[PDB]
Amino acid sequence: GLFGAIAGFIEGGWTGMIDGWYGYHHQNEQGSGYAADQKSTQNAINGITNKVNSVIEKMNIQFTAVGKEFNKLEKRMENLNNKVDDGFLDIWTYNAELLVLLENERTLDFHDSNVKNLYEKVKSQLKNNAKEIGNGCFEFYHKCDNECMESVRNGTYDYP
Amino acid sequence: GLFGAIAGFIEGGWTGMIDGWYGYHHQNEQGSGYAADQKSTQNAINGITNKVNSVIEKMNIQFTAVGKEFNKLEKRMENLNNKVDDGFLDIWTYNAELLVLLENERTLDFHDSNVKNLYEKVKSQLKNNAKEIGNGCFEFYHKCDNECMESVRNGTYDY
Amino acid sequence: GLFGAIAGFIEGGWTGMIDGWYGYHHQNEQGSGYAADQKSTQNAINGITNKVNSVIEKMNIQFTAVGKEFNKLEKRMENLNNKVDDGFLDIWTYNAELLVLLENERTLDFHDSNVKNLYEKVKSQLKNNAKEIGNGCFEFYHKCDNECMESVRNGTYDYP
Amino acid sequence: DTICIGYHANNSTDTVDTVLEKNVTVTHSVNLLEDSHNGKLCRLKGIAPLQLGKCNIAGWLLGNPECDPLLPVRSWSYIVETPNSENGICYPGDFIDYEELREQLSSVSSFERFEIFPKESSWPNHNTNGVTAACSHEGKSSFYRNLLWLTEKEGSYPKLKNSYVNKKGKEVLVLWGIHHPPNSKEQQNLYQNENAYVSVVTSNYNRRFTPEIAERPKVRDQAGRMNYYWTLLKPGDTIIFEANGNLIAPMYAFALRRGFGSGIITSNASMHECNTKCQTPLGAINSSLPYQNIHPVTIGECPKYVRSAKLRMVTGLRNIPAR
Amino acid sequence: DTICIGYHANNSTDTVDTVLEKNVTVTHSVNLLEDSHNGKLCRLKGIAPLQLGKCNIAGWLLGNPECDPLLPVRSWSYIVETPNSENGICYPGDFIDYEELREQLSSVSSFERFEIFPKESSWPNHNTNGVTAACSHEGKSSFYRNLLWLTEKEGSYPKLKNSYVNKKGKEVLVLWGIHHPPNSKEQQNLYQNENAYVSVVTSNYNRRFTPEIAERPKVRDQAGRMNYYWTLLKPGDTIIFEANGNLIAPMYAFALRRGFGSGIITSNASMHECNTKCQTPLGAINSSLPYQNIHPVTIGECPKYVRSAKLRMVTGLRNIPAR
Amino acid sequence: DTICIGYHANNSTDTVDTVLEKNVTVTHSVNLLEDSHNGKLCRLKGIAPLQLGKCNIAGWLLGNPECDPLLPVRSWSYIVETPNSENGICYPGDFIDYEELREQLSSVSSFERFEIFPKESSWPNHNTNGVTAACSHEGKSSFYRNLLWLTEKEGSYPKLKNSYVNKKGKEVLVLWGIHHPPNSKEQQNLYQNENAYVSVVTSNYNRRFTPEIAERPKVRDQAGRMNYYWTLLKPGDTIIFEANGNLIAPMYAFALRRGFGSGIITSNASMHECNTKCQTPLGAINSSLPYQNIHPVTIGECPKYVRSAKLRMVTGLRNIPAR
């Protein structure tokens, strides 16, 4: 990954989280579970949705396009027509395939990026009240309850 | 933003700074103010200027292009010409719009990255002599007069 | 660079490093030396190889294409053939040049990212057993021999 | 107490390609390439296509006896020819500017077939029962339904002159022929005048025709030849036919109505009571995707044809179940 | 003591679209789409265009009396026809290869109109006073200024043979016509001979013309027809006219000079004393931007036409005044 | 004890361009633009090209005496004309549909030149020794090798009619000409009959030719003209020639075999005993690169032509030896 998070310092995904693309695990004395960050997951959905819609919108509809006949003494005209049709077809096939290949790369990085900024955003909050273990986890020092875990999710906490 | 700085851990911009795109604020005994980091603002100006000039340079001048007449018995030739003109027009309109869309995203994220790298550059310079009070600001643990502030801006801060 | 490492906080390259693109500079009591990180260098090679292969594969082979003749009363057809040939040529020249220009920028960012992520990988390991010099180096507190310098290269160490 | 930051994963097997890596498994994605059609010919927004079947444009417009079932059709959304559209002209010869005629019919949404020259009152001094085995129907010699083979009457072929004023308020496609006997003897038995000519004129059309008599190889066992011509008569204009022989006169003509989006396609698929906004020679497409790899020939509003086998845009992220 | 790292912001309301988000406000940006035009038709690098006005190429080259104001023009940067360019040929007929002739004039930067066959001295044995109400001027029957209607003189039309050697050092455009009477009576009254013919030849041009007599619908009050032809006589070559009737002889021909960048456009804009490097049918463009959405028809050095409504490239960053 | 993380650097001087910065020195790069080629025209996959040298397609097919060295060549991979290919037709005239014939030959992989109408036995009642100073060989008046100039014999030119049935199992290209004397006198002593005609017909070809007599500017010292025509006789079909004068009869014809990937190019380069899969008018290319800036004209399997001067993709990183 371009940003180091996905398939990076955070080895894998969680089949357990089904509310969004990015979220938290958390396991307090009250219990465990999973929670998705609407803020992130949503913004991600808005961008990608806009991307796919742009890609689709740029390829406005194809209107009637049919072959044409040429008599035996119009071989040059028939070949010119053939060059035109093959030429345009070559370019559009190329354009479609490149755009998708390229934007797919960008999309994955975008996600890697979002997971990254979500991680650092929490790390800047907690600060000293916990330590960075592994796989992007934070082991609390003061031990905070579920109601507290939520302060971290909504972006408050307060306790440098 | 891809790098988390602009509209990120540095919520907004400074209508107060007007020397470049990136800079520093700074509060001192001798007073306050703004200052743009010429070094990173210029690099950014060179890069974007080049990008814009490339987009322009790649589109060569459009030379004379006009319509053509066809008699009543040349309907197939007329439609072929029409297919050609519209075909090319479709590709170029597509190319221009996509290039601009794609690069505008890249430019924004480029700036995000620059601010991000500027912030981290100062941090690696200050270290223990200051604390990250969030939002991209640093509180010194000693007195940093104007002469000292400038050492931070030109990256020569003596730890 | 977009990621700050290359030509950034790691000011220069090592003409001494000849095993890969990314690596570590060794400096123990037993001696010094360089060593490439095969892990990162290989993944980078697989990525760039696939990229250049994609660009090539997308430009399918050009088959027979020649000129045509037109008599003196076929000036319009001749000009049409000319508009068609110049039009396609303009597009492919434009496509090839833009694609190369854009992907080169991306390839460079790619390397920058790889160097950055490798650095952040080692920093997390040495985090509590050395200090960050700043030039991309780390000074061990306890000072570790070659057998330990290796535990750093192969991603183990685990000595917080 | 701990709290971790992580990302979604699932059982999805969707794969996509990127510039750096091929076949990357992801959690969510969208296909942008339409590869499905219903394998049928359909009505285009409620209107059925004109199926020429065993006939082709030429057979249809001339009135080849083998295409009588088409005579009543007045409107269509697109024209369909098949690999077996062999019945065109039945009497050997050349169809002048035939490809351009096909191009013209390509923007016709409908026409009215009418008698421009009524067989019974148009030619008082000429026979009109000319028939040929080359255009047989029901095992008997016949002729084109829209033309009339005029010949000598009682040993005489008076110089004829007939005209038609277009008062249809639309362009009128007029077709006719010129017969070319294989020898001077036939020319005489059929038209009497040894040196005949046919003249056809309008305000913007003007051509003269001279019989070219010579022995030729037999096609549909005819040594003779018949050349076919056509012109578009503008609303209000007049067309004048003058001849002293060899004229294969117009009997039925067509008042054309123009439309958009039509075209002529070739297909071996069958017509069904189905409706679509997008028809291909292989079948109809019902899709919102920007591309399709079904067929390059398209009638209506369709996705752009591309040669790609796959075009999938990743939406979610790299899928790593981590089992 | 504190020090904060930050970024510029301002009062800009410029917006740009990106892949992920639309209408994003930014501090600085550049427009790449030229949408401004001058209105007006201008000189192109100092040279004025040719304005056929009420006339079209045919009327101009043949010398239609309605186009006399154009007779003296010798050079131009481009040609302009208007929606009102109706006066072309005045005597009904067909202009053979007219489109190719238009294409030819499209690369002509200038020419010299000269008498290839002086009215008096070229045709000693024929009348040249022929005129027609179809080409009237000042309410009087007249004729093309560049052609001559040759007819019988004193009950006789001798076979004529006149030639011209191109010593202009440039290609010479020669035009002429063939008259087709409506009936044999007129054919004889005008040319005396019933089986007339016209022959025109050069080192690389060879054609024969035969009168085709027949009644035809009237156009501009004429039942007769006049076909127009042309050819490019190479430098040093000779053109020979031979005929015993029906010839509408060349009187003036054109020595052509070739150039680059010219063309024919259709516009209703007016000519002003302005200078430009880029002209469209709607007005002149003065820009360095890469694209324009003004018009696809272009003369000179212009930005590329695209259908886009907006094309703006962001240079600054996301504007967040943080006010 | 210290452990540093760094990157590779070297002495490479390779430069590439990016969107943000030009001429960036990098450690590793790869060229994608082929700019190297043989001079030298080569065999295409073992087969040699057809070098017309001082002859063009016309001279070759008609059998211009100046191109006899070409007569034996039966197959080729591509056709090569040179800037000096001026020997086409030697007797002045027009080669009807010449460009279409060039296009036809462009997909011909091989043919067999054969006697369609043997000189001795085909024309018993006509002289077949006509020759002209315009088609001289060895300082002596000669004539095309694939055609025969038929003329009066013993003061008479009987009506002729000859046929040929295509039993080759392949299309047969047939060529012939029509002579147009400069005056009535030449018409008389060459063919006697004053008003002659030529007819040529097949199952799908049907044309008649009338001699057009007229004095014309001299070309190759000839005031007369000769028009050349051709047609493709389908397998099993029959072509019939009928004439009472002015026919330049076919003697040799060609049974054609079709292939793919061939074409006609114009080159100043020389043939060498080299083999290539890609040929351009400047030299052959041996490359796997996707692009080339050598020439737009290519035969075989080549890189896409582009106007670019440089196309280098960086693979390594920014090179900073830090010396």
UniProtKB/TrEMBL annotation, chains A, C:
Coiled coil spans: none
Disulphide linkage map: C144-C148
Protein's name according to its UniProt entry: Hemagglutinin HA2 chain
Span within the parent record: 344 to 503 of 565
UniProtKB/TrEMBL annotation, chains D, E, F:
Disulfide bond residue pairs: C42-C274, C55-C67, C90-C135, C278-C302
Secretion signal span: none
Coiled coil: none
Protein name: Hemagglutinin HA1 chain
Residues of the full protein shown: 18 to 338 of 565
Organism for this UniProt entry: Influenza A virus
